[PDB]
Structures are given as structure tokens and as C-alpha cells.
Amino acid sequence: FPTLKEWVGKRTIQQMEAHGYSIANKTFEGTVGISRDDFEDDNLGIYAPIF
Amino acid sequence: FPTLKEWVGKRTIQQMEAHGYSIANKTFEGTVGISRDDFEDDNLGIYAPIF
């Protein structure tokens, strides 16, 4: 609200202001490729924790 | 009251002083106007916190 000012004549109508702002989303990706043979020919379990 | 001076002859009649000071009252005002259309058509709530 405007700061109060001395009342000399008749009330003066004044104006306020409104603001706006927006942020747009984005998409992200990441992928890897492990061959079927190497994944299946694995007794050690070294490749197991990829998830 | 006058400081006490040494008495030698007669008594000298001094005088004092009174003081005054006044502060006058002032009138302040502030006014904001929004159209009825703009107030009722607001479906967002931006103009709600004016009071």
C-alpha cells in the first residue's frame, strides 16, 4: 500500500502493482549398454549392481 | 532558581523565566482504487491481500 501522505484537499486515488514469474520443467536421461553374453557369462557377480 | 551569591550589602531582586513549546496535529491519508470488474473477475487471488 502507498505510504500515507498529508490530507490537504480531497483523497487522491493511487495505484498498486502485481508481479509474475514462471519456471519451465526439463527432461533428463542416462543409459548404458552391456552385451547379453557378458551379462550372462558372469559367475563373479561383478556386473550385478548396475541398478 | 538563581545561584546563591555572597551577601554584602542589600538584597538584589533577580527574575526567573518560563518556557513554552507547542506541537500541532497533522492529518494523513492514503487511497487505492480497483474496478469492480477487475475485482470480481480475479480467479487467482492476487488482489485479495489489499486490506
From Swiss-Prot, chains A, B:
Disulfide bonds: none annotated. It is found in: Virion; Host cytoplasm. Induction: Expressed in the late phase of the viral replicative cycle. Expression of late genes is activated by the viral late transcription activator C. Capsid protein that self-assembles to form an icosahedral capsid, about 54 nm in diameter. Part of the immature prohead complex. Interaction between the viral portal protein and the viral protease I may give rise to an early 25S initiator complex. The scaffolding protein Z and the capsid protein T should then be added to the initiator complex to yield immature procapsid. Host GroEL and GroES are also essential for the correct assembly of viral capsids. This is Major capsid protein. It comes from Escherichia phage Mu. The gene is T. The chain holds residues 52 to 102 of 305 of the full protein.
